[PDB]
Amino acid sequence: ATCADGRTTANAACCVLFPILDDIQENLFDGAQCGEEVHESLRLTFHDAIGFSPTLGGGGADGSIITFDTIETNFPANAGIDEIVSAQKPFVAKHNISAGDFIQFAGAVGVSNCPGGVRIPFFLGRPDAVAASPDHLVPEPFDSVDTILARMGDAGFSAVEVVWLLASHSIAAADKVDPSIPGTPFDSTPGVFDSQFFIETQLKGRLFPGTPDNKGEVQSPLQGEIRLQSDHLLARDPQTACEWQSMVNNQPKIQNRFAGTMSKMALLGQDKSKLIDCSDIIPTPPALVGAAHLPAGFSLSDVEQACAETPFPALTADPGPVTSVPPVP
Ligand code: HEM
Ligand SMILES: [Ca+2]
Ligand SMILES: [Ca+2]
Numbered sequence: 001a002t003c004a005d006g007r008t009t010a011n012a013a014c015c016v017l018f019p020i021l022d023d024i025q026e027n028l029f030d031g032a033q034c035g036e037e038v039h040e041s042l043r044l045t046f047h048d049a050i051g052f053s054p055t056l057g058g059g060g061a062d063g064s065i066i067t068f069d070t071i072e073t074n075f076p077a078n079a080g081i082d083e084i085v086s087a088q089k090p091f092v093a094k095h096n097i098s099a100g101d102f103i104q105f106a107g108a109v110g111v112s113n114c115p116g117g118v119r120i121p122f123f124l125g126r127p128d129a130v131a132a133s134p135d136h137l138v139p140e141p142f143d144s145v146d147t148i149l150a151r152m153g154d155a156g157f158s159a160v161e162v163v164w165l166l167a168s169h170s171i172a173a174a175d176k177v178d179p180s181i182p183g184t185p186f187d188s189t190p191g192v193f194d195s196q197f198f199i200e201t202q203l204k205g206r207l208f209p210g211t212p213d214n215k216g217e218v219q220s221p222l223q224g225e226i227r228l229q230s231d232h233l234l235a236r237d238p239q240t241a242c243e244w245q246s247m248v249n250n251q252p253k254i255q256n257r258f259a260g261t262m263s264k265m266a267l268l269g270q271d272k273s274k275l276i277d278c279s280d281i282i283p284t285p286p287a288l289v290g291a292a293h294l295p296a297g298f299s300l301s302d303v304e305q306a307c308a309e310t311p312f313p314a315l316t317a318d319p320g321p322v323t324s325v326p327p328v329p
Helices: 012-027 036-049 080-096 099-112 145-155 159-171 196-200 229-234 241-246 253-267
Strands: 058-059
Touching: 012 080, 012 099, 036 080, 036 099, 036 159, 036 253, 080 099, 099 253, 145 159, 145 196, 159 196, 159 229, 159 241, 159 253
Parallel strands: none
Antiparallel strands: none
């Protein structure tokens, strides 16, 4: 099919997405960058979608976190997402797609801006939300590992799928976990979609990067990096440790599994056979930059081995003294 300006796509319904693509790239993502708006939009995809349970209810990836923002942004687990919900709302208002489609589309376009990123399949046609999500369906970083896995399982994800979706923490920071240091990232390369998250969470903790008594946070290996309690434990739990370790220096697997599992997340509450394939709209991401490494001054003896079947791979360290990671602007 050929769209209004001559750009093409397999399914013509998808032509609606070209001016939306252009508008969010310029006016949401600061000129197609992998920065804070892309990171918040990616988080939003999960907080919208995971509000789904075959028994507890919720419409899943239905745009409810925007349509019913006054309800959902008041759930404690949604702290900090009000900003991106406010930023996206006028795009939904202006443009010609459901809030469900818009959230997942913005997250996919966002990921494609990040060096190392992957094109996440995108389907169009989600109906409008019927009702606010129930509260208590979004995992919290202070939840037990088995609780997080059971919650994700109830929505349809295996434990290894949860590991793959957490590749998102490779381009991610926290503003509310420790509000003394907002914008502190979960890995040393929040602008690069890469394996450093899976490496750096496996290091022995050393220090709190800000204050010491924040719920859902544990010690970080690096100044200027924050570590969630949930990620710390998922990196070490028998259900997930070996899969977590398997991501290290495995860019193609991180890309392939993130894409396929985000597509599945993006379809929670929906039926792929009742939607239109618009995957060809998503831009080609930039090449990965950098290579898998231990942080400066670390060695393999600083890794806490938790995978019972295979040892953690040796990785070179960056040269020099240890360093601080700058916050996400
Ligand atoms: C599996 C359980 C998960 C837990 C416990 C968890 C927890 C968190 C927390 C506590 C934050 C910091 C929010 C803040 O204080 O600003 C965060 C940020 C983020 N999360 Fe996760 N998350 C989970 C899964 C996911 C998934 C499946 C995605 C997939 C899209 C995701 C994407 C993100 C992103 C991109 C950010 C960065 C937000 C920003 O930079 O401001 N998370 N997550
Ligand atoms: Ca929802
Ligand atoms: Ca990264």
